[PDB]
Scaffold this motif. Structure first.
Motif: not given
Lengths: 134, 135
Positions: A43, A45-46, A72, A79-82, A16, A76-77, A84
């Motif tokens: 977004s 994610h880690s 929702k 980009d649609g990701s949830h 990215k 939610i991000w 984690d």
């Protein structure tokens, strides 16, 4: 395909690219600013992605691409990701609105909820890096 | 032939002459203004030429002679020359228009796309310097 090429003023991490924007924006204003640069509000994610961001994060707070919309029923991000991975500040998330909360990242990297009309001096976008042909 | 002679009120750089116009104009207004002074909206073909212009660039933006007409596909200078040198700002060109985009020069000298009906306070014309006959 090695994918680590980013445009001028963006910074690569993994596959990215990231843009550390400055200027006063409400959440959707920032969303549009990212759109205009062919990115999206970041977004995350880690922990390693977060650590990269924290090192470069505005001291006075930044919008990120996370929201809790009642339709929702969960965060939610863009980009649609949830969610984690999370990096909530102590006591967060604490709802500001019961219907529509946006999320910001402090200078520490830790997250908190905000009303989406909050004016912040910074915002982070991301996009996918481009790839070197084999 | 040495070619460094410019008309009154123009500035020489290399083999060209430049006019730094001030006054609120949309792109084609600027285009016509340049034509009426027997020049054209500026074309930029080297880092040295850009540097000359950057040093004189209006802080609030200036029209230059670059435009993307869907009917050529590509950005073309008003004199018909193509882009060899570019000085796009980061992330530019970002198309504004669905069809016809004009180009402006920021105070930094970097270029960005704009709708052609944007009103800017400055514009730059050029023309060829005239030449001294060999002595």
């Amino acid at each position: 395909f090695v994918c680590n090429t980013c445009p001028e003023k963006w910074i690569n991490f993994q596959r990215k690219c990231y843009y550390f924007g400055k200027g006063t924006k409400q959440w959707v204003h920032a969303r549009y600013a990212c759109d205009d640069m062919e990115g999206q509000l970041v977004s995350i994610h880690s922990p390693e992605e977060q650590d990269f961001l924290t090192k470069r994060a505005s001291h006075t707070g930044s919008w990120i691409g996370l929201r809790n919309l009642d339709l929702k029923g969960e965060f939610i991000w863009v980009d649609g990701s949830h969610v984690d991975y999370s990096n909530w500040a102590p006591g967060e998330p604490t709802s500001r609105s019961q219907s529509e909360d946006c999320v910001m990242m402090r200078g520490s990297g830790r997250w908190n909820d905000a009303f989406c009309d909050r004016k912040l001096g910074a915002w982070v976008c991301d996009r996918l890096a481009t790839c070197t042909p084999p």
